[PDB]
Amino acid sequence: TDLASIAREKGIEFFLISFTDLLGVQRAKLVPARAIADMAVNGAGFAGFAAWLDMSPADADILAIPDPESLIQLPWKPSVGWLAADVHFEGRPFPKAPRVALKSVLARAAGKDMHLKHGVECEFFLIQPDGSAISDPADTQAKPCYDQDALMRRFDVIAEICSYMVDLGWGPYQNDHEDANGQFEMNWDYADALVTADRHAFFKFMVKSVAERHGLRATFMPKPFAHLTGNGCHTHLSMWTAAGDNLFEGDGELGLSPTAYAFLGGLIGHAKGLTAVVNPTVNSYKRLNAPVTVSGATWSPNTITYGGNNRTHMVRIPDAGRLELRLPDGAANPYLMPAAILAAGLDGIETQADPGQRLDIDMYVEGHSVEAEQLPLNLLDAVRALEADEVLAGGLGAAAAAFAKFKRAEWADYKSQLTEWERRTTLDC
Amino acid sequence: TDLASIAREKGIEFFLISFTDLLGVQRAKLVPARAIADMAVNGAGFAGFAAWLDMSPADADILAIPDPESLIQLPWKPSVGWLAADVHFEGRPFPKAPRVALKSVLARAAGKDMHLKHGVECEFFLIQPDGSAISDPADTQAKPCYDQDALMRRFDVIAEICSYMVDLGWGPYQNDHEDANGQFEMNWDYADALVTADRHAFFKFMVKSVAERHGLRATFMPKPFAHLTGNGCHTHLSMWTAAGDNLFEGDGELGLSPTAYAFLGGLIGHAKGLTAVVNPTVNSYKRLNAPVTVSGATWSPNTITYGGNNRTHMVRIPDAGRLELRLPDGAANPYLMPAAILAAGLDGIETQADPGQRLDIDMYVEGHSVEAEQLPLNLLDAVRALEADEVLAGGLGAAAAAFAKFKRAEWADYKSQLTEWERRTTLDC
Amino acid sequence: TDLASIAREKGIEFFLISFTDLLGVQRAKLVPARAIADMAVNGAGFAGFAAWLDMSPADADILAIPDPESLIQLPWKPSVGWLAADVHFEGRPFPKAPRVALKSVLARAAGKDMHLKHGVECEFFLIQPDGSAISDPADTQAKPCYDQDALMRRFDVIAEICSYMVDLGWGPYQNDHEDANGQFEMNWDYADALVTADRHAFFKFMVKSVAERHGLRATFMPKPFAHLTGNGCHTHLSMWTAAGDNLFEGDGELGLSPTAYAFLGGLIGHAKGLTAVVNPTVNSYKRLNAPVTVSGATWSPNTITYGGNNRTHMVRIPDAGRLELRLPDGAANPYLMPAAILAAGLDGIETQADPGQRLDIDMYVEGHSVEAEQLPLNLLDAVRALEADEVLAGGLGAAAAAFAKFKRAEWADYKSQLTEWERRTTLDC
Ligand SMILES: Nc1ncnc2c1ncn2[C@@H]1O[C@H](COP(=O)(O)OP(=O)(O)CP(=O)(O)O)[C@@H](O)[C@H]1O
Ligand SMILES: Nc1ncnc2c1ncn2[C@@H]1O[C@H](COP(=O)(O)OP(=O)(O)CP(=O)(O)O)[C@@H](O)[C@H]1O
Ligand SMILES: Nc1ncnc2c1ncn2[C@@H]1O[C@H](COP(=O)(O)OP(=O)(O)CP(=O)(O)O)[C@@H](O)[C@H]1O
């Protein structure tokens, strides 16, 4: 792939050489086309301490080496070409970088002829530019899910993005108004994990950019409104052979194989530590274990459990040959999430983990009359669990410890904030 | 070069005959094409006392003789042609004028077959017209460096200026959102010092003019916001023979030659006086030795030290064959800065100056763990050092004493200003 | 002295056991009469780190032992008795406490039969409660000094305090409107240095308190208004034998003795370090070396010089038998100031210091016509001089080092404040 030739052919005047840091932030440099060949070979230089990579201002620059197969001409601005990149440091891929970490786990699975494919359901809200309320003041009803009126009221922005995804070859197939007022979701086809991760990273940027062009704002925040359903990132998962067979497809219950159940056994066994990574913010813990919403259900997990075609659990089995992890939220890192899921799932397979008993009940109601482990209740406990989880931490490489350091500091920063609630309830102590 | 003929050919209707004064202020006269031939030969008359040149209202006019090879048709207004000029007084170049002062030092070095080449990293903020806040209220995060979102939010202005630089033949190659919210930087190829100095003077005017056309404002202020990273002007330096060999390239530590280390010895040796010139404002001293910023590092020097590929010192060695002086800020005079740097480095070469021990540590966390000289803490102390430095004062000629005079007065003016901080902390003494 | 008996007899219901810290802050504990006997013997406990004493939160409490001879029943609230105290730490007088530091230097002088007596002219402004403007909007003229109208407009507050001083036995004898609009001064009789120091500490508290009772606010700030004269604390000084002979009285010039001139020699010799103590704030340096005021003179020192009956110098000789040190401002510590002056003076006497030639000229218009040493121009330079001054630093003991540490930090805090002036003069650099 000759980026310089493509630039001339396609009318690309600038490239964004982009990488995702440990907090999911999209870091990028805008390089004119005249300079792209040098960047493609040598990488684009960044001072790593200035991003969430856990480095030092005394370190040599990281070099972000773009993956030319990731190229996307911005559909709303085709003269700019976006590239995803691997962060290198001292002549090697830098293990603290999320994309590099995912590729490491992918390579170990590939080594055993197991290829992760996943799809993501990236819920988002459309809100006012100042972020104080949803973008549509006429979207107010108690059960607004799939509301035809409010959906069509945002047809222009939804249709524009959906059409871009058609053009990009992602195979979009549905657009919904989701369960909270102001909340939407646009699905597209699953793919090899690295393809989906790059798409996931690009998708969020695309949605935010387009919303902004329409005088709106998009947020993937886990719990932007106290009494409304939160933003999930439900992740659909299966493992394939290079020959093209889905290893999860089987003759067991619900059409799953023993490999599928073992992979699930790993998700279940490592759930506490996995929460730290797929629920990576303080705010994440207001979506999990949340009080019932105005629409009648939170639709998020409270417990470390799985069901059949049942949306009240940590894991749902929607159909034969795949698992839906409902645990992640909209803040989950597009690269770290698949990486930690894969690490856990692999350990499950390797150890033939038992996921325990499928629960065919509504956990929100018929959950108090059963023994089920509760998810970590806050970021601190989740991070504590990640640190104690040798498989996850080891699986993610140096990314895990750096991630844990940052999230601990975020939690501490959160603790120090004085809230109006404490004042009202404690001033008269 | 026939400016009159060029005017007819290129459709230039007015020329800005411009020179830079001791404070870096761009002084210009707008002359209609009909009058250019006269100005080219004879120079444009200015009352020198009215600019920062340390003259008298009783003096005969200075004559600014334009350098025809410096011609730039304003890319945003091609009917106007900008020219850099040498200030002449009483029939000869005026030593108090920055460009003249630079050319004098360059000629002494050239006499020894040593040709300074440099590049500049001119950081700037984009702010509201009233100067009170950055231009992008959505650019708020603690670590905004290389933020893809904020970068693309200013694509139009950044892309316009980058494309001008392509057309101008400067070889631009990267555009970044820098470490402070609202802060950016656009790099271009190094060149002979005089070429880069003229480009540097033009660039700042270009950035400000274009920002203003977009309803924005650009500032090169060293420290426009108390808790954010400031505007550096990191200067990359090498010395070349007329035959085309880089004298700094060598077999020693980090691919540097003894000549490079001696030049560096001169920078370290004259650092206190050099600080007055490359940090020429009261505000400069709020960038140097600053308390840690929200982003986690100031990225500016505190000490007279150097490192390898390490951004925590006064000098960084980014790669074989050059030095990065991190000392200067956005207020540094585009002509006086290379001038003082060269005077210092030349002396280091002539005396075989020892730069001392390279420090492979983060000076921000380890400044105490070592004996290092601190930079002058304020403009008064810097100017005192400059006045005491015979090599610098001698190297800059009469420019040095005039500059010191002005900067002493600025510091005295600053001292006389009553601050809100003082009233808060002293009213109850 | 039986404070419990005095309490019963005078109707004192509470005592303020007070000590002055290194920044001059009055620290006090309010003790009901039933507990005074205990406090008088054992001392009143305080956590020393919580005041400006350079201690540790891990230190045992300091004990402030009240001087029963210092008792003052607050004239505006006689049921409360104020006591000055010596801070003890671990069973010994605490050398970092100003009053203890002063008593140490007095002891050394007394051991040589030399007893310091001094009087203080404590200028202050009466300002609005919010501190933004003077209290009398009708006080506006260019030369308001001794203005009959404005003086009588504040007759009630001035007369109340003056009558208080009469009753306290301080021998008040004049009340003036001073040279700045809104500025006043009330003089009282000199006394033994420790008496005057205690009186000085109480006086500031009394003026502030009574002003507040009248809906006004008093400030001793050195330079509260940019273009107005500042608050001096002119200190009148003589040295006496126990027998009662003024050692400064003599047959030399102006009725001064060789002892007086040697003491003066100490003041001149140690002036740079002395400045740090008697001009202890950043703001202090806006009073010293200030641009001429609306009234035609600053009345503060610019240079290390002395004159006769002449108010343009650092030292004035008002009459035979005493020296006026015009250096100190309204922020000067009531204890540290006489302590530092005495240490310098004693050294002068010890070494027979030569004060140099008396200058019988106006230094404001004659600064150029003579070779004179300028005073430290800012707090940082003053503190540097203090640390370099062995006699002074040694004479003040550990208080000097603690003071210097604090004042360095204040200067650094000041440096970090972005001023509107910088913005205006630097945004377009
Ligand atoms: N075998 C498989 N492995 C991984 N992902 C798969 C998969 N089969 C389908 N997917 C993906 O999972 C995501 C969701 O698929 P689908 O929409 O059919 O499930 P679901 O109907 O439970 C979602 P919703 O409730 O929003 O309608 C899609 O991106 C889809 O491509
Ligand atoms: N031998 C040399 N002498 C002087 N300047 C040189 C040079 N080689 C490169 N430069 C210049 O130095 C400037 C910076 O170059 P470069 O971008 O490679 O360094 P760097 O990566 O440390 C900058 P940043 O941190 O912003 O990415 C450019 O103007 C470049 O042209
Ligand atoms: N021998 C001495 N030693 C120390 N202080 C003395 C002194 N004799 C007088 N003083 C004191 O000096 C202070 C000022 O004295 P005085 O008012 O006479 O001088 P001055 O007239 O220069 C003051 P102003 O300019 O405000 O009118 C008073 O506190 C006074 O008691």
Numbering used by the authors:
A (entry chain A), B (entry chain B), C (entry chain C): 2 to 430
Task: Tell me what the authors wrote about this structure, in their words.
Monomethylamine (MMA) is an important climate-active oceanic trace gas and ubiquitous in the oceans. γ-Glutamylmethylamide synthetase (GmaS) catalyzes the conversion of MMA to γ-glutamylmethylamide, the first step in MMA metabolism in many marine bacteria. The recombinant RhGmaS was active to catalyze the ligation of MMA and glutamate to produce GMA, with ATP and Mg2+ as cofactors. Sequence analysis indicates that GmaS is closely related to, but distinct from, the glutamine synthetase (GS) family, one of the oldest and most ubiquitously existing families of enzymes in biota. However, gel filtration analysis demonstrated that RhGmaS is a dodecamer in solution, which is consistent with the result of electron microscopic analysis.
Phosphoaminophosphonic acid-adenylate ester (AMPPNP) and phosphomethylphosphonic acid-adenylate ester (AMPPCP) are nonhydrolyzable ATP analogs. In the crystal structure of apo-RhGmaS, the electron densities of residues Pro292-Trp300 are rather poor, and we could not place these residues during structural refinement, indicating a relatively high flexibility of this region. However, in the crystal structure of the RhGmaS–AMPPCP complex, the electron densities of this region are clear, and the conformation of the loop Lys287-Ile305 is different from that in the apo-RhGmaS structure, suggesting that the binding of the ATP molecule will lead to the conformation change of the loop Lys287-Ile305. Residues involved in binding ATP are identified based on the crystal structure of the RhGmaS–AMPPCP complex. The residue Tyr191 forms pi–pi stacking interaction with the adenine moiety of ATP, and residues His237 and Ser239 interact with the adenine moiety through hydrogen bonds. Trp189 forms a hydrogen bond with the ribose moiety, and residues Glu122, Tyr174, Gln175, Arg312, and Arg317 participate in binding the phosphate moieties of ATP. We noticed that the AMPPCP molecule exhibits two conformations in the RhGmaS–AMPPCP complex, suggesting that the binding of ATP without glutamate and Mg2+ may not be tight. In fact, when we cocrystallized RhGmaS and AMPPCP, we also added Mg2+ in the protein solution, but the fact that no Mg2+ presents in the RhGmaS–AMPPCP complex suggests that Mg2+ is bound after the binding of glutamate. Interestingly, Arg288 is located in the flexible loop Lys287-Ile305, and the conformations of this loop in the RhGmaS–AMPPCP complex and the RhGmaS–AMPPNP–MetSox complex are identical. This result indicates that the conformational change of loop Lys287-Ile305 due to ATP binding will facilitate the subsequent binding of glutamate.
